[PDB]
Amino acid sequence: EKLFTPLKVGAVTAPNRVFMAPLTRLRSIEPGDIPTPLMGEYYRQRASAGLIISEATQISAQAKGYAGAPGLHSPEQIAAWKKITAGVHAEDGRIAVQLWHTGRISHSSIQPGGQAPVSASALNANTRTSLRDENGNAIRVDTTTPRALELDEIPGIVNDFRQAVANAREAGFDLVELHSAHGYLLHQFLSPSSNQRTDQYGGSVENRARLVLEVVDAVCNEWSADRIGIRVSPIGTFQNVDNGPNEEADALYLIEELAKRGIAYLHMSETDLAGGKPYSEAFRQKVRERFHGVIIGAGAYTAEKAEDLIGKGLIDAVAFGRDYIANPDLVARLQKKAELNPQRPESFYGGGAEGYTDYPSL
Numbered sequence: 001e002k003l004f005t006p007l008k009v010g011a012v013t014a015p016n017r018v019f020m021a022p023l024t025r026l027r028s029i030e031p032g033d034i035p036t037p038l039m040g041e042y043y044r045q046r047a048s049a050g051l052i053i054s055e056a057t058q059i060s061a062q063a064k065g066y067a068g069a070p071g072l073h074s075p076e077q078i079a080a081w082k083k084i085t086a087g088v089h090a091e092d093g094r095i096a097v098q099l100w101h102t103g104r105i106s107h108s109s110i111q112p113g114g115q116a117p118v119s120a121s122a123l124n125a126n127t128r129t130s131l132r133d134e135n136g137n138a139i140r141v142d143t144t145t146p147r148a149l150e151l152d153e154i155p156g157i158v159n160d161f162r163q164a165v166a167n168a169r170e171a172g173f174d175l176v177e178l179h180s181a182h183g184y185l186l187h188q189f190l191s192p193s194s195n196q197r198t199d200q201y202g203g204s205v206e207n208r209a210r211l212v213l214e215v216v217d218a219v220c221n222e223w224s225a226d227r228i229g230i231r232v233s234p235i236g237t238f239q240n241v242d243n244g245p246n247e248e249a250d251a252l253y254l255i256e257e258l259a260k261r262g263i264a265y266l267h268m269s270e271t272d273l274a275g276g277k278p279y280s281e282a283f284r285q286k287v288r289e290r291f292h293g294v295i296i297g298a299g300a301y302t303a304e305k306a307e308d309l310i311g312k313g314l315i316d317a318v319a320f321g322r323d324y325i326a327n328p329d330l331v332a333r334l335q336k337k338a339e340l341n342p343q344r345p346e347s348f349y350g351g352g353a354e355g356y357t358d359y360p361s362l
């Protein structure tokens with residue numbers, strides 16, 4: 001067994017390789033998209049994780065795509081997050097904030113001025129997002145057709161990521177994870193299916209990867225490369241966003257480029273919740289030899305699978321999502337081979353303490 005052995009992850013050292021995957025729970029306060037004391041308790045209960053990766057958090061107001069998602073751009077938000085990281089550290093844990101811009105997966109009613117959301121192109125995501133009704137309850141609503149970002153608006157996006165990382169540092173986070181997966185803004189530029197731009201930000205894989213790499217350089221410069229992690233979902237289809245006709249080659253290109261920056265880790269989201277083709281060991285080997293930092297595998301993993309891949313030297317750690325929603329002390333349970341609490345999907349999004357902080361520990 002190696003899941004319970006130490007691992008150096010950038011600037012910090014995890015005591016085990018069982019990580020908590022980023023999980024949107026939509027329980028923040030509005031107006032203000034402010035983290036709450038309840039959220040602080042939720043994270044504190046899971047502080048035994050090798051590393052906690054927070055729910056996706058807005059780098060700006062424009063970045064908001066769901067009612068209830070927190071931000072990390074205002075004074076009130078920074079003050080709230082400082083309390084949450086402090087709680088995690090009080091329990092000797094480590095926490096990374098996942099920073100994102102939802103792009104076209106949003107709705108005009110929650111955008112600044114009630115205007116249309118932005119993306120690489122003016123193409124509707126053809127999916128749904130979550131808003132809140134008059135009672136504060138979560139509701140699914142179709143996404144609003146986005147406006148294509150103009151060339152001179154790109155630097156502003158990079159700067160928002162840069163500022164959010166500076167904010168993350170002050171808020172006490174140990175690391176930052178750039179959300180470059182699951183069909184959100186960065187992935188929208190990476191995928192040819194959602195990117196029809198004719199400037200230097202569209203077309204070739206070099207052009208499509210330009211935005212995410214500019215962000216990576218900006219945040220490494222703002223803080224430090226060993227504090228930066230990135231999540232990608234380069235193989236398969238996620239929330240209607242595929243990875244083009246040459247996904248494997250494009251994936252390896254991106255990974256080689258990320259490797260040049262010497263960042264802390266590469267978080268590979270292997271499958272959409274609806275499923276996808278499994279990674280071949282040959283592909284894992286090609287990824288392995290191209291990145292020199294920590295590699296985290298994710299997506300419907302079993303403890304057995306994690307041990308198998310870590311043992312083969314293909315990945316270093318595994319991020320569990322839904323199992324962490326239902327098991328605050330997942331590390332102890334996996335170590336003792338104890339049964340897990342059953343999941344209650346109806347309370348994954350919105351609401352309050354029920355289905356959030358009421359899953360018991362052993």
Ligand SMILES: Cc1cc2nc3c(=O)[nH]c(=O)nc-3n(C[C@H](O)[C@H](O)[C@H](O)COP(=O)(O)O)c2cc1C
Pocket residue numbers: 021022023024025054055056098179181182231269273298299300301319320321322323348349
């Ligand atoms: C409720 C819910 C919220 C999610 N929100 C996030 C998120 O904020 N950011 C992210 O990158 N993925 C998110 N995911 C995906 C998870 O991180 C994870 O990759 C996925 O659940 C598959 O892993 P699992 O089988 O261990 O749950 C979410 C999934 C669920 C079920």
Ligand SMILES: O=[N+]([O-])c1cc([N+](=O)[O-])c(O)c([N+](=O)[O-])c1
Pocket residue numbers: 024055056066100179181182184238239273
């Ligand atoms: O519906 N959800 O709230 C949701 C949200 C995010 N996100 O980054 O905040 C995801 O990445 C996913 N996802 O791809 O699993 C789902």
